[PDB]
């Protein structure tokens with residue numbers, strides 16, 4: 298697997314031991330061969346788990362998530378961020394991506410960068426995932442048999458007709474299509490006397506610990522838990538539905554759907570259970586079919602925005618990883634920014650915590666990071682609502698204004714927490 302100019306897809310079925318058994322073997326061999334190696338973990342939670350699997354081995358943990366060399370370990374997003382910034386990144390001879398199905402824009406971009414370096418003959422790479430891009434198998438092998446049942450799954454509060462949900466006496470991981478939908482289901486379950494933990498992208502690294510430290514009956518989670526999150530559960534309830542960010546008329550981003558998940562997403566959701574060879578009969582209840590909803594999904598356009606701004610060699614631009622390259626229609630290099638606008642782009646995404654697409658619109662317009670006039674001078678149909686009335690903030694000048702951004706990205710106000718963060722941004726508070 299370790300030879301140069303080779304990209305290996307390590308696609309053992311879920312729970313087969315890719316992360317805990319195969320990975321340390323790979324690391325020991327890479328150290329013996331003096332290969333400069335990067336290990337890419339999807340989340341800080343997984344990075345901390347990897348330190349336990351890699352205990353003893355000389356690995357530099359480039360994250361504060363690990364309380365503790367020619368092997369570096371960092372998060373997917375950190376790798377892509379460092380490539381975008383002036384910071385020097387080693388030309389790693391061996392690039393290991395764990396949970397390489399992650400569809401975050403930074404993860405897609407990292408796969409494009411790594412796979413291009415391999416294609417140029419400069420490096421080796423190992424992509425670890427049970428569900429490579431394009432998988433059509435929602436029901437892969439597992440360590441113990443799974444009971445699969447197609448069934449109508451509630452997506453709103455319910456009173457009758459779903460007794461099977463609450464009659465269960467084990468622990469359930471329930472994949473919902475959005476934070477707001479999960480809030481409603483959570484409230485309904487809590488009213489029925491269940492103890493519920495909710496997880497989403499921005500709360501995961503913090504709230505996941507409650508699944509170890511607290512008694513719980515349900516974990517209500519968005520698709521973030523598709524990325525190596527381990528639960529001691531015996532049932533998965535899968536709405537089989539997700540929101541799809543879509544760029545409309547090249548001018549705005551909406552959150553379309555909910556709509557079907559990909560086969561890979563469904564397989565990863567189901568793959569939370571059936572992982573213990575000593576506990577057969579975990580249950581997977583699924584509420585819809587699968588479809589290729591990554592086609593036209595904004596994350597792959599946003600990956601091209603990132604990759605267009607990563608230096609590879611002179612003027613060349615890395616391509617997306619071939620199996621996922623057709624999921625976006627874009628002109629190669631069309632998002633490349635000059636030095637100063639690229640710095641603004643990066644700052645809008647990191648400190649600004651704006652979605653990639655929105656950060657690009659602002660930076661490519663020549664706006665500097667601290668200049669928030671664009672948050673207020675949009676068209677009337679770009680007005681953002683809070684509790685059914687136009688949302689308002691005090692500008693950094695002390696004037697109360699309606700939030701009406703020049704470019705509208707639905708992800709800045711899809712839940713209360715997102716809106717709170719964007720209001721603070723519009724006010725100049727970060």
Ligand SMILES: Nc1ncnc2c1ncn2[C@@H]1O[C@H](COP(=O)(O)OP(=O)(O)O)[C@@H](O)[C@H]1O
Pocket residue numbers: 309310311312313314315316317318440527572573574
């Ligand atoms: N902390 C742990 N202690 C013991 N076994 C674990 C632990 N975490 C995961 N496992 C088990 O180890 C096996 C392999 O896990 P893993 O390497 O994560 O599989 P994969 O990466 O192929 O999905 C699975 O059966 C999983 O349930």
Ligand SMILES: [Mn+2]
Pocket residue numbers: 315316317395396525
């Ligand atoms: Mn794994």
